[PDB]
Design a protein around this ligand. Structure first.
Ligand code: HEM
Ligand code: HEM
Lengths: 253, 250
């Protein structure tokens, strides 16, 4: 109760009387000496979560319940206090549903973690759509997990077509049949042949046509499994320009 | 229902918890509420760190939260955040300790997902062949790839926080902040979508032909742009060789 760090509160469906903790007063940004009031509790809230609050108290009134709703208050000028109000029902007897008691939780840090994840996901999508090189992400066994827009244009598969399939569908033989062992050999020996180095190889479209590409791989670890992020650059025009360079310099020579 | 409730009074060392509280702990529902039973659900290294925490809160004053996982239900553990405070019987005697049990399995999944995305962001930043740069709505560098460091000669910690205009010659340098500013109001892109060959400037002072590709995104009321920069210094080496060789024919 002293230094608890969590607010507590009470509200009765009949007589609408409310008593919150002193730790709860600070969370609402008001109440230095003034008394607890449910109308005052409304005043601190912004007028969207308001209607969701009485919708919640009407929902928990009906037969049963469970009460948890989240909101932000205007405590400070350029910041908001995010609070998750959680509560449970206690009936007097078999007769009616009397006062509902609960807690106020400070969920500033949880919402901060939320937004950070949301930003990272949004940004990952932008990287996938914008990157000029074809970006492919596989798991420890070569199973495509992400497939960039450039990769779609280059290999002729869509993201939904490619994600879940083995990365060896992108390459001709013998590399297609050997690519699983390439990954397994790397994982046991830790001796890289393309990671950090880079290699020009031949990639294969869904058409069946083949094209010269530069491959670059980087590794990561998540939940006990590695993931490999590949970057593919189409060298079909680069060696086409080299084919121009060598044959045009022949008629000079 | 709601979250679980419990109290462990320091006087008489008893402990009682609510009906939703015991389901969170994985209580067999025959067992009664005892403090030695609570410590039997926790895993060994968690156990001692919990018991380290109560010893640090044995000092009269304050509050107590710990997070842990019990694992006997689904092969993936149940995460609980146990938060508690003190009440005092008299002026100098602390008697009861009352608090709550919070299911936080969702809170730990978002943590892990964020961790994975952050790890993958670092992997891309190290590995992408083109220079990747990320700016906010005002042109301040927020992320700076390894390839960008090698191309522009600034370090990540040097570049981040600085305006992106330090990467380009004049007059683009002085005009770049207007370019972003006009784009934000008008929404008419000139490089977003299209892809422009421009000239960039290293910290050296030297310049080079680069290709710029920009992608937009929105987060927290501010746009962010991700620039992909490719050096064309060897591409135009071959283009100059092609131009000289086919001009020597005519
Ligand atoms: C699409 C055409 C591709 C071809 C032809 C190809 C070919 C190869 C070859 C030949 C090796 C082994 C080199 C050696 O042992 O001498 C290799 C290794 C490997 N590749 Fe692929 N690859 C392709 C795409 C990818 C992509 C897109 C990824 C990841 C997203 C990837 C992941 C790996 C990994 C993890 C290894 C083992 C690590 C290493 O040897 O450094 N490959 N690849
Ligand atoms: C380093 C050398 C760079 C140069 C020389 C350069 C040049 C330019 C120019 C000339 C424009 C205006 C186009 C016009 O009005 O016709 C522009 C716009 C823009 N640039 Fe830069 N840029 C550079 C780097 C970057 C990077 C790395 C990013 C992103 C991280 C970026 C973000 C933007 C944005 C958001 C716009 C406005 C939207 C648009 O017009 O597409 N710039 N840039």
């Amino acid at each position: 109760i002293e230094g608890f760090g969590v607010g507590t509160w009470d509200l009765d469906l009949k007589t609408w009387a409310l008593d919150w903790s002193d730790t709860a007063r600070t969370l609402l940004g008001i109440g230095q000496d003034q008394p607890a009031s449910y109308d005052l509790f409304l005043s601190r809230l912004e007028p969207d979560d308001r209607e969701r609050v009485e919708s919640a108290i009407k929902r928990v009134s009906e037969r049963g319940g469970g009460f948890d709703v989240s909101f932000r208050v205007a405590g400070t000028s350029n910041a908001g206090q995010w609070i998750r109000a959680r509560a449970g029902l206690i009936r007097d007897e078999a007769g009616t549903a009397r006062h509902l008691s609960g807690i106020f939780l400070d969920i500033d840090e949880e919402k901060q973690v939320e937004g950070a994840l949301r930003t990272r996901e949004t940004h990952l999508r932008s990287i996938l759509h914008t990157i000029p090189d074809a970006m492919i992400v596989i798991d420890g066994h070569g199973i495509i997990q992400l497939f960039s827009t450039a990769a779609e244009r280059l290999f002729g598969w869509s993201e939904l077509e490619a994600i879940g399939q083995n990365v060896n569908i992108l390459m001709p033989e013998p590399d297609r049949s050997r690519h699983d062992s390439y990954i397994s050999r790397y994982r046991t020996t830790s001796d890289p042949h393309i990671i950090g180095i880079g290699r020009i190889v031949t990639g294969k479209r869904r058409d069946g046509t083949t094209f010269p590409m530069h491959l670059s791989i980087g590794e990561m670890q998540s939940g006990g499994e590695p993931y490999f992020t590949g970057f593919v650059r189409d060298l079909t025009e680069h060696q086409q320009t080299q084919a121009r360079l060598q044959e045009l310099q022949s008629e000079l020579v």
